[PDB]
Structures are given as C-alpha cells and as structure tokens.
Amino acid sequence: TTPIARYRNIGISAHIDAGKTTTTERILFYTGVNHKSAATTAFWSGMAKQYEPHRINIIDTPGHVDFTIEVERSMRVLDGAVMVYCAVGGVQPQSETVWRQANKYKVPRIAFVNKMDRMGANFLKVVNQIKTRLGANPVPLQLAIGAEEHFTGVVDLVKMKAINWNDADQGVTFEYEDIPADMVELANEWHQNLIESAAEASEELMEKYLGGEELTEAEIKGALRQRVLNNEIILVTCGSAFKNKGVQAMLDAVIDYLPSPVDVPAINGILDDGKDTPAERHASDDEPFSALAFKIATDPFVGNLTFFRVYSGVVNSGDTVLNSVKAARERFGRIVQMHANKREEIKEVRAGDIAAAIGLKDVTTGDTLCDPDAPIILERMEFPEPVISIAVEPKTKADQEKMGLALGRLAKEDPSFRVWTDEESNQTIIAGMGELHLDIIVDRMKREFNVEANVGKPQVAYRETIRQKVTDVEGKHAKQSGGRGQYGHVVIDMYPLEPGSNPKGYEFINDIKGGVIPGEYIPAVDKGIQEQLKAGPLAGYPVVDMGIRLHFGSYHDVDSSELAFKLAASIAFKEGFKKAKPVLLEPIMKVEVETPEENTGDVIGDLSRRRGMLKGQESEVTGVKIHAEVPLSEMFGYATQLRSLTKGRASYTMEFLKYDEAPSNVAQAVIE
C-alpha cells in the first residue's frame, strides 16, 4: 500500500497579514474540488488534471517572530517551501527572516505574490525587492495581465499564454488565451529571461541555446526543477487569493517545480550513540525506519497527538520504536492523518509522509523515533534562545500548584517557551521569543487550563559591598548571671576586599599573635562572620567582595565557647558594616546587539537612555555589532523596544559580567 512517493511536502511561510491562511484555505478548496497551525494532507492533479493526483502535505507556518519556533521545525521537516509575498508590502521584515530559516535548512522554495487586486500593487516591484533585499535570483514563471483594480488574471510565461479564471465558478475552471499585445511587449523579454535561466542549469541546454535552437517546454521545466533543487534560483507567480485568480496555477507550479521526498538530500545523524558515526539514513522504505517528532499537541477526546515525519522506513501499529534522544523505549498505535475534511486512522505510514501518532508517552519535540534494531539519532531541530522574561504569580494561592503544571505542559509542547524558579526571589519566571508569544501562553493558561495569573517584572538579585575600611571594631558578647555563661570578645578590622582578588570574594585573616584568642575559637569566629554575609545588615542582600582581619580578643576559662565567639563575631560584624560605607550592587550584563546600520544611532541611544555604558562597536558585513554593559534591572522587555527601533531586524545576546554599584536613586529605591 504505497503511493509512488510523488507526494509534495511543502510549508507556507510569509510575513503577517500576507495571505498564508487565505492561500491554504484556497489550496484545500481546489484540491477538494478535484476530489469527486497544523499539518494537512490534500490531493492535487493539474488544473486540467494533467498531473497524476499527488498527496500534498501543507503546513501554514506562523509569520510572527514570536512564533518562529514553528517555522524552524516546519522548514526542516518539509521538503519544499512556498513563500507568500504581499504585492503592496513586498519583502517585509518577517519575510526576510523566514528566507534565512529556509537558507539554514537549504529548502527549495517558489514565491506566490498575493494581493495583486490591492491598490498600488506592482508584481515586478516585488520581484525587484526579492532580488535586492533577499539577494536571490527571482524568475517570473507567471506574469500578471491585470494590475490593481484592473487585475483580471495571471499570464503563463512558459507557455506564453494568458490564463483566465472564471469569476462565477470561484476559479474552478481555467482558460487559455493569447497575451494582450500591450502585455506581450513585456512578456517576450521576461520569457527570454526564463529561457536563459533554464539553459544555465543544464549546461547541455546552455550550448544549444547559444547556438540558437529553441529550448523545449519539457526541457525548460526540467532545468527549472534542477535549479530550484540546487537552491540557485526562486520561481515567482502572482495571484489574488481573495479574487480566486492565480492560486490554482501556483499549486500546479508547486508540483512541477518542487522536490519529492526522494529528491531532497538524505537526513544526517549519529548512528547509535557515541563515536559520532554518520547515520547517513537514505530516504527509502528499505532503509531502517527513521522519524522526527514536530508539533506535539493534546486533544480532550484523543490521546496526545505527536506529529512525525518518517524520512526512511515504514512504521505500523504494534511496532517497537526507540527514542534515541531520550533513551526511552516506545511503541506505536492509533496513527492518524488529517485530511482537510476529517482525520482517519491509518495502519501504516510510508517514508516521505507526515502523520500524528496518538498516545506517544515519552515523545517530546525534537525526539528521534527509530527502529530499536540498528538505532539512528537524527540531530535535534534548532531551538532559539528566549529574548524576553516576565514573572508569573498566580492570582490565587491555590492556583500555584495548577500554574506550575500548566506552564510545564506549555513548555513541553513549545521548545521556545521556558519556565524556571529563581532561587533568590522564589518567583516563577517565563522566557519567550516575543512579548506577544508570552501573552498568548498566558491567555492559553487562562482560556485553555483554568489558571489566571499576574504578569510582572522579575526581581533583580542585589548584592551588598563595603566602601572604605573601619579598623578596631570590637564585639563583646557576655551573658554571665549565675551558673555557666557564654563569654566571647573579638576585635576585628572590616576592609573592602578587591572584586577580582578571590573566587569567594571573602577573606578571613587569622592575624592573632600570642594566646589572646585560643586557636579552637578562631574557626567559630570565622563561622559567625560568614553567617552574617548570608543576610546583609542593610536591605538583607548577600555581602560580597569584603574581607576581615581578627587581630585581638579575650576569653574566659569556663564561660568561653565556640557559640559565644560566633555571636561576638556577629555583633562586631554588624557594628563595622554600619560604619563602613555600605553600598548595594546591581548585576551588570555584557550585551551584544546585531543591528542594521541605519538604526545603530537609535539602538546606541536606547542603551544610553538605560543606565548602560557602551564598551564597544564592531562594523560587520551583515549588520553592526554593539557591545554595552547594562544593569539587568534596566534590561527588561529590551527586545520589544529593540524591535520597534529596528523593524524587528535586530537580535541581542547577554551574559552576566560583574556587580557594579547601583546609582543612588536606584539604590535607595532597592532599599525601599
């Protein structure tokens, strides 16, 4: 039971508002008419039913940078890609990013220019933008006879024939006719460019074209397939998914110009575990079963749905599987493939196809599912580091137990979303790829699970250090009133130690000379001093970069004890800290920002607006790197402001560097 592996795995990737949902809805309509987010399977022949009906695996990827994680997993799993570009917008910021994600996985892609009907929309401008901004070769498979209000259909460059769709039938019937003479003057030149590109890939067709023999349609289409697989060129088509003209043709182009599961390069991995031996799993049923888990989901009336892509081998119900990454033995049952109208149980899944295994107990996102015999570990998909963090506190105390379970469930399904409890504030901090991404997880925790919560700013971990040295600090602890009392006298010198002097940042000096303090009690004095560092006298924050010297003291034959010396050391420590200049320290982060050159002045100004101090600036072939030292308190929701300044084209990384002292206004604020 196998289709001839001519299925077209594809992913719809575009900027927000471009038309990804409208185009995919129209894709389901036309394929469904041909028959008598989430992965979907359809069946598409040609518009004239010329092509054998092929399974089309279509995923509409989310445009927002907040939901980039889903674009990443989709591009890897899907053999082909279709990039929607708005005709008015052209190459918008997010569309620039999705190109780079496709570039990372070397995914062959074609381009659909949507919204041709919209006013001030130029198909050639968008092609020009694709060539200049994305630095790629765009070839016009289809030109547009009409523009804006007068948009009436899409012309085909390869056949040099105009196509008219039927407004009454909702685009169901295609028509072929002559190109209008005004339109043809431009079509000839673009058709010549299409011919020139096809010849270059074949090399054999190049010499023939130079000699002067006309290239075959059979031969041009072949060469164009060749180059899309090479990734050298991109193919552009124009249509209106609202006026129902052009979407139908783009699908036929997808089937005739995009790769099969066999056409793409075989998945690379580590065979078994250790020695990094290349798995080299060829994409075919004979090779040992290999699959990857993407987009795990939960259904109320069904078990957890774990969408998977079988590169090689065939999986069946009642088949043992190995989770290579989690080292967990697994079994497969109740597999389901979702057609546009319905989801159906399937007993087996051939290689090159995507399905959702219900009830996979140990399968998280980025897990490799393989046969236990001959195990293979395909690499985990790229997981982006979070860019913004907020504190979540449950509105009710009862919700805390539920909230932790809910955020963990959200964190299991989505790799980008992260949750942790900071040891200092004991608060729950969540980290996400965008402000909107965190907002949607919060709404899901309320709308989906029954847990409403309060968003907040994480509490920074302040430290205390001493400025100036106070000498002769004496601390006498005496509790003698009958029987056995506890007596300890210690004279200590509290001085500010250098920040880089020692790893602990604390130094205790046994400068005792003679029998003033018995050796046995000096460790107890040291123990009391370390305990005091744990809770600073002013604001309760941990003491750091401070050292002390014990030079003198007193004792009693019966009363003196280790506990007594520890309490005396604590009294002296407090007195010395009170007189030494106590300053709170604010954690400083080393921040590196990659920004387009035009917005560098804006990003540098934003960092200067924060109490952050610039330490560096590197001009780069792509973008400009800016290095700055900014207190973490100032670094809140920085990604939102950074994206507003740079049109979401700027990314930043940070690392804790040191604890420079806070400004007085901020430090007094911390004390309160």
């Binding site: 580091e385 979070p386 963090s389 992260r418 942790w420 900071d422 200092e424 504030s425 608060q427 901090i429 980290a431 994480p458 509490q459 920074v460 971990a461 302040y462 430290r463 604010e586 954690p587 982060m589 973490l632 308190s633 670094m635 809140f636 940070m654 690392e655 804790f656 604890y659």
Partner: peptide, 8 residues
Amino acid sequence: XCWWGXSG
C-alpha cells in the same frame, strides 16, 4: 533575578 541565562 532577570533572564533565561539564570544570573541576578
């Protein structure tokens, strides 16, 4: 207390 890299 303040970002996925742990730190204050």
